[PDB]
Amino acid sequence: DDRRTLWTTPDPSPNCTIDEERDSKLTLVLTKCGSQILANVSLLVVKGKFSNINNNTNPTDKKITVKLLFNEKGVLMDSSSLKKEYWNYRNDNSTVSQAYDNAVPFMPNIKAYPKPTTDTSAKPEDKKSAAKRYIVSNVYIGGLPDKTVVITIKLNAETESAYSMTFEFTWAKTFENLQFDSSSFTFSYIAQEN
Amino acid sequence: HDDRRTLWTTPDPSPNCTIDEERDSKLTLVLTKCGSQILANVSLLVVKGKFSNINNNTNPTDKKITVKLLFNEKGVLMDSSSLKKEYWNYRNDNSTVSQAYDNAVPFMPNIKAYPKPTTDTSAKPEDKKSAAKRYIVSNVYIGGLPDKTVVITIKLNAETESAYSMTFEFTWAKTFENLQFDSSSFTFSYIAQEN
Amino acid sequence: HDDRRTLWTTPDPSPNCTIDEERDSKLTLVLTKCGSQILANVSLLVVKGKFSNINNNTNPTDKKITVKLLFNEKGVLMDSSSLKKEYWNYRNDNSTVSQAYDNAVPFMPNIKAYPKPTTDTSAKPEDKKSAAKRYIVSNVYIGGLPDKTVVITIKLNAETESAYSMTFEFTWAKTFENLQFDSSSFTFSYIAQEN
């Protein structure tokens, strides 16, 4: 039993809805290293549209969005892309018996990543960072170096939640009969506390 | 409340960093000690002066930002650093410990992994020291926009004037037009010194 | 003292890695356990042989380096690994513990996350296992120079002859001209096994 790891499991059952119910397996591991969460994420789409990307037949199919929305206790809300049953603290290679009550120490820090406001100040010195809540990099479908995908992670940008972590996968290339299967990506973010 | 495993700006700093003019930028830098590695997270918002409004039509040579942290043998930030000292400290809640730290050696880049560059080329060519190992190079994105590519170059212990150093170099090849420098967050690690 | 939360080369290794000829490279690899994840940091300097002076005018096919770590069921490095065993160990200061380790299972890539590839023509298409999840693919830069791009491909538990494995593949498309292979440092993580 391990409250320093919040994860899917390492080998989840279909646990993620992109197009149809549970069409994907999100493997997401959050490990608390004090003031930072060390995050690791991979996504396999097992059925439906993104199990077979074809941008000759479907030229608009170039984006996948996975949304994790959390309430003020850091509990996953039902409106999340990820399903709740095996999103929990680590026990061995599974989850603790019952649903967690609190994961605030795993939430994106609300000072670093405040909930977006519509501030009326033009003055570039009054600007709140737009970019700081983003992690943007590349992952590779099948770990093939030519199959470039942009991964965009955004923290606490979702309006209808206390905290949020969204994963956006986009590609410019024309993929042809290609199962969405992302090489693993590691990032970190500043942690909230109790 | 008080946390010697985190050395940070705060997570929401006041202007704390000089690129062009005094305190024209906000560097958000968190160093978290995970034993023999420091887990580093860095973002930079330029609030005033040249890089608060990059324009490479008017200023085609404005394609580089260098932020230097220089540390003495105790790991104290030297006044010549780009980063200002007032809120560079160990974590207390979402702020810093009351008084200035006197020692942060355990957050310094390991001096065996990243020795201070020497003026020796007389070495046995196989005893030649890595030039690259002290570098982290990747991309960040202004506004997190995927077209606004910036190269981030981090260099450890390369500054001659200091016992330890951590330098952030942001460069771009594209012609940016009235664009506030605002980098997506970057995570890296480095091998830690010890006391 | 002694630190079983760090499994490393040393931070400043002697030639410890065979790419072409015996001990022609220095691999600096640090694995630090942060619970259910290993925080990994890797850099590679080739000190002698072909890749100490890459020339793709003279040798246009010399565009790949592979470093293989193979582990048995106890997480002990097997002799068929690219890396040499003498200074692959738990941390003591900037060196290794006196005696070779018996067990490093808690540093191995998680076998549920990264199962050994099977040749299963039993294939309910929805039960198809990830090909990509065991990969980390990114760029490093020789000399930390932004133009000297190298692809780094890390694969976990893909080697057939071992209980666990971690392979580093460096590739480039550009024509390098009298360039010592010297990679900027790369940080990643992976999900840890436990005992």
Residue numbers in the entry:
A (entry chain B): 184 to 377
B (entry chain C), C (entry chain A): 183 to 377
Question: Which statements did the authors publish about this structure?
Answer:
Each protein forms key interactions to promote cell infection, with the terminal domain of the fiber, the fiber knob protein, interacting with the viruses’ primary cell entry receptor. The adenovirus fiber knob protein is known to have a highly conserved trimeric structure. Sialic acid (SA) usage has been proposed as a cell infection mechanism for EKC causing HAdV-D. Here we highlight an important role for SA engagement by many HAdV-D. We provide apo state crystal structures of 7 previously undetermined HAdV-D fiber-knob proteins, and structures of HAdV-D25, D29, D30 and D53 fiber-knob proteins in complex with SA. Our findings demonstrate a conserved binding site for sialic acid, common across the species D adenoviruses, therefore suggesting that, along with CAR, the receptor can be used to initiate cell entry.
We performed X-ray crystallography to generate structures of species D human adenovirus fiber knob proteins HAdV-D15, D24, D29, D30, D32 and D53 in their apo states. CAR binding was investigated for fiber knob proteins of HAdV-D24, D26 and D32, and was found to be significantly weaker interacting. The respective IC50 values were quantified as 0.02931, 0.001261 and 0.01996 µg/10e5 cells. These values represent fold changes of 162, 6 and 110 times weaker compared with the IC50 value measured for HAdV-C5 fiber knob protein.
